[PDB]
UniProtKB/Swiss-Prot annotation, chain B:
Name under which the protein is recorded: Nicotinamide phosphoribosyltransferase
Tissues of expression: Expressed in large amounts in bone marrow, liver tissue, and muscle. Also present in heart, placenta, lung, and kidney tissues.
Molecular function per GO: cytokine activity; identical protein binding; nicotinamide phosphoribosyltransferase activity
Enzyme kind, highest EC tier: transferase
Location of the protein in the cell: Nucleus; Cytoplasm; Secreted
Keywords (A to Z) from UniProt: Acetylation, Biological rhythms, Cytokine, Cytoplasm, Glycosyltransferase, Nucleus, Phosphoprotein, Pyridine nucleotide biosynthesis, Secreted, Transferase
GO cellular component: cell junction; cytosol; extracellular exosome; nuclear speck
Primary localization class, coarse: nucleus
Pathway it works in: Cofactor biosynthesis; NAD(+) biosynthesis; nicotinamide D-ribonucleotide from 5-phospho-alpha-D-ribose 1-diphosphate and nicotinamide: step 1/1
Species for this entry: Homo sapiens (Human)
The EC number(s) this enzyme carries: 2.4.2.12
Coiled-coil residues: none
UniProt-listed GO biological process terms: cell-cell signaling; circadian regulation of gene expression; inflammatory response; NAD biosynthetic process; positive regulation of canonical NF-kappaB signal transduction; positive regulation of cell population proliferation; positive regulation of ERK1 and ERK2 cascade; positive regulation of gene expression
Family: Belongs to the NAPRTase family.
Length: 468, 472
């Protein structure tokens, strides 16, 4: 990986664009103002370690960038001198200071989350060179936020229909491995999901967490055996019962998920699971239930009909809240067409039909990890302060067309209000000490990570109020 | 170091226990299922995955032990198929006994056709075909980026030809701004590579290194860029010094095209008063080869572009081209780089045509729309098992959910053929064996750990050409 080639093309030309005698460039990141009123800050530590720390400049990487940019621009605009200065004076370590709110923190929209500035007047251009790298923080931030908002919905309806939050952490399972754009995205996004839940089929997220964050337990996420359409349909259309019987027998003492919509979902629940193989189901342990998985049709209508079918073939109880409950050896997972919008429609529809959320878990793939954009939380990186000719000026952009696009001014700090909320102070006014100490911590300075967090601390920082 | 044993969906670790006993072959295919309609898809991206993740010695004793340890904790049971993976290590030196056949990269294929097939070449590795489903299915992303980018090229081609009379500079009309708007570094390189199948302009440098490394081009670089300002380089001069920043930047880049974002404070003021009066003398002296490209970054995309053009038309000498459409002087152009996606792009060029503005005046930049706002759902990319051999007898397998007709899968051994009318057809149940449809267009691209056929990025670009381009 070459950091010289890891930025937007036009930033190669920006060192020629600042006012002469600019010694400091200071920029910040924010999620500008389900409304997504607060965001989980997560992901920066991965980027600091993988891409920014240590000796990131070498003579080979300088020559490599020079050659590519010569052709890419059909001209020689690359700042070979500036990158050679960093190589010689700092042994390839970036003269940059980054301050950030602790990872896992839940911060309302419109607050400074991290800031970036150069620690050497010669590398004024370096602050915004690494904008492209740092701005991709939007994705772990957005995945963790949107997953936590789904946890809020599940927590509300689980508590309503069951009376507690038992198993809340396993109610949203990550199916997004094949639905995302790359391997690296799969690991990043799955790790952001594991901030809030414990269930994932995306194995790459586990290795990311151990390498860059760490956890007391051996792994941060868990899975169960499960069938796919290929392992069912390979038996032939007339032998779906044989496949079902073989699979739950092979996994008789662990939980097993079995997709049951290969040909007819309703038929499989009523006659195969509910009549032919019913004796293999009711014999199952509470620890290892059969989890029927519908994979097609309208998500809410399918779940309700599936439950109504199973309720008439199996012994239903009424829990202490008055809500119906399958026997402990039988559960349901809906892992098709689940995003935050449809998830809300399902649990509300289940509650209206007096079904407890204990009966169901959810799986999400593309919605959980792929259908998200930087626009969703307005993740933005803008320069707020420069020093030219020895006097610093507060800088901002205020487009006439859009008020929302307006940016913060000057040196920034994050503080607690007297009522315990968050406030971002502008124009260096945090130096007046009317709001206490600045919340941001130096996490990166001059090529070294100076403060880090375990994935256990991040999980505790990210918990819901209902859980506290 | 990447471990292929840890690069699949968790539950596929347990699937070797789930197939019918005495199964010697598992045969699966990839397609963009039938449901801007997206009637045809550019096949691109598989060669990247074959080389980066699948070829060579991908199994080692350390990687087997590593997977065993993680899996035991992950499932809280021992389900990992250590025996099957050690067989591949000892018998084939860690090379995957798999054969992959595929339509050539760059080919434009209508929806509902087999694009590649996967099968095991050793009866002991029946489970391996679908183990690598997750790795292979991620080809949906370069396929979808290339298809959606080509569809935007179609729109630009139609309106450029209508308002100008030719397609000059079409391959530069959609610029890739998506580096910071995507989910990771690897995604940025893959997606920018798929955009360069259809265009030449990119700010995502990672796509260039991917192409050189995995595909290659006769030319030194696949994509090109121009110097450009951002809000940070303008606003750093101060509120009252936007004119100073403008003047400094166009003078530093007197000799090449330079894009200057002009909406930091007031976009309309910048074009009418600053570009159009204060600095007009630095603009009109510019060469045709190195024009000033004014960039508006906010407000309604169509309304801003129209008002910007109306402002510039009154401060600068406009001509009427041979089609009757208005044209800025060659030293002055416009680029709209905000809020551009396939739907918005169509709205802009149509609105420009209604106001008698040539598409020659404008280029477009897209970030999130071009590379991040796409899903596997859009082209219905799907990987399914269509054929298996059990007890020596091959059977055609498929899924036919009652709730959804669209979810139904193809049956048996598959082949892709040219029809008598020149269209494409996918033959099911091994019927391609009959030879009534000509030669199978799928070629073996991967067999037993080796990439057996590869394509240059030059061939891919030729294969993906628009019909309008061919006639011209
Ligand atoms: O009772 C436990 N287990 C068995 C169990 C109970 C309820 C349900 S509801 C769907 C599955 C399931 C399974 C203990 C032991 C630990 C789990 N516990 C859980 N409590 C509440 N809801 C849970 N959902 N899942 C779950 C979700 C998705 C998947 C899959 F297939 F996608 F990977 C697998 C399991 C676990 C839940 C506590
Ligand atoms: O002298 C050439 N062009 C100058 C030119 C003409 C029209 C326009 S309209 C926007 C820019 C522009 C620039 C030759 C040489 C090669 C280019 N030619 C092109 N012909 C037609 N449309 C083109 N758009 N772009 C373009 C788009 C985006 C960006 C960026 F990076 F800022 F985003 C830069 C340039 C080039 C066009 C032919
Ligand atoms: Cl999905």
């Amino acid at each position: 990986f070459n950091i010289l080639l890891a930025t937007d093309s036009y930033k190669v030309t920006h060192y020629k664009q600042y006012p002469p005698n600019t010694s400091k460039v200071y920029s910040y990141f924010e999620c500008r103002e389900v409304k997504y009123e607060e965001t989980v800050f997560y992901g920066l530590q991965y980027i600091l370690n993988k891409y920014l720390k240590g000796k990131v400049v070498t003579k080979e990487k300088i020559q490599e960038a020079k050659d590519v940019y010569k052709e890419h621009f059909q001209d020689d605009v690359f700042n070979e001198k500036g990158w050679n200065y960093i190589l010689e004076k700092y042994d390839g370590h970036l003269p940059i200071e980054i301050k950030a709110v602790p990872e896992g923190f839940v911060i309302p929209r419109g607050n400074v989350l991290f800031t970036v500035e150069n620690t050497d007047p010669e590398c004024y251009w370096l602050t915004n060179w690494i904008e492209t790298i740092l701005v991709q923080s939007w994705y772990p931030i957005t995945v963790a936020t949107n997953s936590r908002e789904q946890k809020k919905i599940l927590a509300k309806y689980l508590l309503e229909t069951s009376g507690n939050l038992d198993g809340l952490e396993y109610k949203l399972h990550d199916f997004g491995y094949r639905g995302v754009s790359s391997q690296e995205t799969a690991g990043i996004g799955a790790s952001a999901h594991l901030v809030n839940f414990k269930g994932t089929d995306t194995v790459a997220g586990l290795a990311l967490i151990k390498k860059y964050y760490g956890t007391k337990d051996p792994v941060p996420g868990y899975s169960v055996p499960a069938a796919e359409h290929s392992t069912i349909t390979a038996w032939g259309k007339d032998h779906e019962k044989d496949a079902f019987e073989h699979i739950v027998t092979q996994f008789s003492s662990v939980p097993v998920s079995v997709v049951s919509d290969s040909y007819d979902i309703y038929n499989a629940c009523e006659k195969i699971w509910g009549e032919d193989l019913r004796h293999l189901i009711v014999s199952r342990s509470t620890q290892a239930p059969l989890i029927i998985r519908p994979d097609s049709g309208n998500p809410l209508d399918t779940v309700l009909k599936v439950l109504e079918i199973l309720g008439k073939k199996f012994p239903v109880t009424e829990n202490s809240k008055g809500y119906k409950l399958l026997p402990p050896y039988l559960r349901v997972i809906q892992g098709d067409g689940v995003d935050i919008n449809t998830l809300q429609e399902i649990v509300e529809g289940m509650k209206q039909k007096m079904w407890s959320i204990e009966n169901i878990a959810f799986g999400s793939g593309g919605g959980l990890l792929q259908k998200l954009t930087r626009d969703l939380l307005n993740c933005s990186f803008k320069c707020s302060y420069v020093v030219t000719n020895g006097l610093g000026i507060n800088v901002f952009k205020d487009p006439v067309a859009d008020p929302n696009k307006r940016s913060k001014k000057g040196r920034l700090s994050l503080h607690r209000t007297p009522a315990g909320n968050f406030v971002t102070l502008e124009e260096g006014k945090g130096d007046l000490e009317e709001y206490g100490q600045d919340l941001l911590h130096t996490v990166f300075k001059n090529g070294k990570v100076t403060k880090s967090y375990s994935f256990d601390e991040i999980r505790k920082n990210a918990q819901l109020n209902i859980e506290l």
